[PDB]
Write a protein that binds this ligand. Structure first.
Ligand code: NAG
Ligand code: RIP
Length: 246
């Protein structure tokens, strides 16, 4: 399992958490020195448990599929909560079975559905350590609309930060003050599967992407990524989604 405590949290302790999260994900191979997530894992070993504590020490446990860093559901006291999608239903066969009751959330876990449920896009939701403290607190008691925004915060501050050093750094900058994600952050999130695929295809293609990936940079400028010498590949992405899952 991995854990993170908001009480006394700072950029260092958050960085330790994101490091633990990355290190908890199994891989047998690296592609261009980036860990390649597994095609599949059987049984309960597919799921990592993340124990998150709000500033008051209240806790939820979040189940993450280790092949794709997708959050499947979470346990808050004696109630489990899962996304309304087949991968999450499957997960509910393995994790939090000791919950007194199971609630299936009235949406799947994808960004489009969550934004619809929350009534706002990711672009308008501040993120940061305080936002994560809020998110944990919201998830403690069921409120589906509130939970959708909380989950948008949770996904970006855990999974997305694990995937991209830039996103981890963005959250560290927001340790004590939330701010909406940069356009670059949103771009990276949206591009993880594409980048993972192209980095894998570049092996066999002399480091060259079969298809360029378009990203927004730190300056808000749209840029084309065409090969593995790009800073996004050498110095940003930390985990690759396996092409078998794309
Ligand atoms: C590789 O990527 C860099 C951008 O980082 C670019 O300047 C260079 O022209 C690219 N080379 C090829 C062969 O695509
Ligand atoms: O399908 C994706 C993944 O779940 C991502 O990690 C979170 O948002 C969704 O759009």
């Amino acid at each position: 399992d991995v854990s993170f405590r908001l009480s006394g949290a700072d950029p260092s302790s958050y960085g330790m958490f994101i490091k633990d999260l990355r290190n908890a994900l199994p891989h047998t191979e690296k592609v261009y020195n980036i860990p390649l997530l597994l095609p599949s894992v059987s049984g309960a070993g597919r799921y990592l448990l993340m124990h998150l504590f709000n500033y008051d020490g209240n806790t939820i446990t979040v189940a993450v599929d280790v092949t794709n860093v997708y959050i499947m559901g979470y346990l808050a006291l004696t109630t489990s909560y899962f996304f309304n999608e087949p991968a999450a239903d499957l997960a509910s066969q393995y994790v939090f079975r000791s919950a007194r009751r199971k609630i299936t959330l009235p949406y799947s876990g994808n960004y489009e559905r969550l934004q619809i449920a929350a009534g706002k896009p990711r672009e308008k939701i501040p993120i940061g350590l305080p936002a994560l403290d809020t998110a944990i607190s919201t998830l403690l008691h069921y409120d589906s609309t509130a939970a959708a925004g909380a989950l948008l915060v949770l996904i970006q501050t855990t999974a997305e930060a694990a995937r991209f050093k830039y996103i981890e750094q963005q959250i560290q900058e927001r340790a004590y003050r939330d701010e909406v994600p940069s356009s670059a952050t949103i771009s990276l999130e949206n591009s993880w599967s594409g980048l993972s695929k192209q980095i894998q295809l570049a092996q066999g293609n002399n480091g060259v992407f079969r298809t360029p990936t378009v990203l927004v940079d730190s300056k808000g400028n749209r840029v084309q990524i065409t090969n593995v010498t790009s800073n996004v590949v050498t110095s940003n992405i930390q985990l690759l989604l396996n092409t078998k899952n794309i």
